[PDB]
């Protein structure tokens, strides 16, 4: 009875304190059943995970047949088209941009969540901004687990996916770590580390862990940010740094 | 090597 309705989920603002915000609005009995329960489990995390460059849920009301989820409103829209759009980022903007997505994912793991559909198509821009935030969303595929490895199913976008998921293996939070090294390599210079025409050609590609550093481009981008890369895309899960130690090099510890 | 710009290749597609 706060909340009035605007344009289209769909827009809104509290009555008291007038904040604009993201409805997501769901329904009866469509969405089936159980297909309402499988967004039980999912809205259950975002509720868990209250950090600024997190889409944060801030409201869960059940009306009559519908269902009402208060969000974070993001405009700035996707990463990934900002992307698009620049070409790739100076070292600068990325090591602020991807400094964002660490400290989101840090604070979602020390949570014990872990997201495993993390892309560039996953993260939004508060504004288009030359510094604005950069916040987490779709928890989907996100899943609650303790320290201990197991094989919990296999999901998460191909390009991203990490070595230890492809061998079918037991794998944990770095799977994430893995899909950063990605990202941060695409915002260096805008291209994929992995890719093929080809699905299986692609996840051998990634299982074998090959990528490179082609010329020119690659040949004037400081070996300090490489390292972290290669640091992500460090195919043996448990050497491959975690978000908390990521945040504390010196290529992203240089706010000056 | 060389694969496509991240603007060419379009945007992912995810897997169950």
Redesign the interface.
Known sequence: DNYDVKEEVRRCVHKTTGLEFAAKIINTKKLSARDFQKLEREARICRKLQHPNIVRLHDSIQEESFHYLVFDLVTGGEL?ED??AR??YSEADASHCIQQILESIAYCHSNGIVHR?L???NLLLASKAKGAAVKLADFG?AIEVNDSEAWH?????????SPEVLKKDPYSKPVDIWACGVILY?LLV???????EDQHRLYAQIKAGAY?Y?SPEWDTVTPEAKSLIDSMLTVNPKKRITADQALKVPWICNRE | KRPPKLGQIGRSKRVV
């Open positions: 990934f992307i698009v070409e790739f559909n892309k560039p198509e595929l199913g296999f999901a998460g976008t191909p390009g991203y996916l695409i805008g291209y994929p580390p992995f890719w093929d490179d082609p």
